[PDB]
């Protein structure tokens, strides 16, 4: 009932996807060496101060396994809808469609739904 | 209505502060040097890409302005609700009690209303 509260492990990831999936979507299509670098940093830092060490820790294993792919907005998007896949897999979540990425962080769907 | 749709310039300020204020609470009380800057370049990072240039362009000259003081969890909390403020007064909304920011985003309220 109250709004205004400290949020929990299932909120915070709901912020945090929220917050990665929409910076992704904006990123150039045709980021600079600078850019490509700057945003492979910032996904690390995120790792190190994700707090609850059993997410971040698997997050930063699961990111040593898999780094980021910084090169293009295209790469960029569709390899954070995969890290998140991973995740919804491990919690018995289905698949997210990686192709609606956009429609779902950018753009609004097709459909106009979100009109 | 539908729930489900990128999120406009005020849901991601909610979700972006939430995960701001989340990420403070739970840094070191006493953080390594390498901690303190990591989470200096986290702050710096984070203001290089959030999207829409007019919000990231004011809290770049704001953060120029003003250096994240990361130096303990104490300092780097209140140094992020004064900054948070800035942005408030800016838009005409009140100042938030900076000393109420573990109950807000930490403990909980400590009549209990978050139980
Ligand atoms: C980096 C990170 C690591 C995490 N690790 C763990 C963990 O180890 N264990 C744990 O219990 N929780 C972890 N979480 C929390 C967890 O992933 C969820 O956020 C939480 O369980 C709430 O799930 P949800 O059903 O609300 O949807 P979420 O998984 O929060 O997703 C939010 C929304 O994003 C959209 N979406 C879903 N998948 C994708 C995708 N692949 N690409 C783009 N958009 C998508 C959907 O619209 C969905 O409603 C983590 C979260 C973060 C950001
Ligand atoms: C880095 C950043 C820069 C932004 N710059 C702009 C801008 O230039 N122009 C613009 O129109 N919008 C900007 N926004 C969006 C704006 O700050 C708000 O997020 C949006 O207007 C929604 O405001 P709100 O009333 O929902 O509460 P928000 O300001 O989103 O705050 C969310 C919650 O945090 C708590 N809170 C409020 N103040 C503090 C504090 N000082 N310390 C700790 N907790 C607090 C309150 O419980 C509040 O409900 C920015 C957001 C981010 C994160
Ligand atoms: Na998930
Ligand atoms: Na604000």
């Known amino acids: 009932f109250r709004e205004d509260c400290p949020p929990d492990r299932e909120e915070l990831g709901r912020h945090s996807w929220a917050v990665l999936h929409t910076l992704a979507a ?31 820790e698997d997050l930063r294993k699961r990111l040593a396994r898999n780094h980021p792919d910084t090169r293009t907005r ?15 897999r491990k919690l018995g979540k289905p698949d997210f469609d990686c192709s609606k990425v956009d429609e779902r962080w950018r753009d609004g769907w097709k459909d106009g739904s979100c009109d």
């Open 26 to 56: 904006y990123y150039p299509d045709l980021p600079t060496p600078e850019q490509q670098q700057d945003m492979a940093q910032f996904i690390h830092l995120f790792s190190k101060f994700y707090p609850a060490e059993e997410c971040a």
């Open 74 to 88: 295209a790469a960029f998007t569709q390899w954070l809808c995969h890290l998140h896949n991973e995740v919804n």
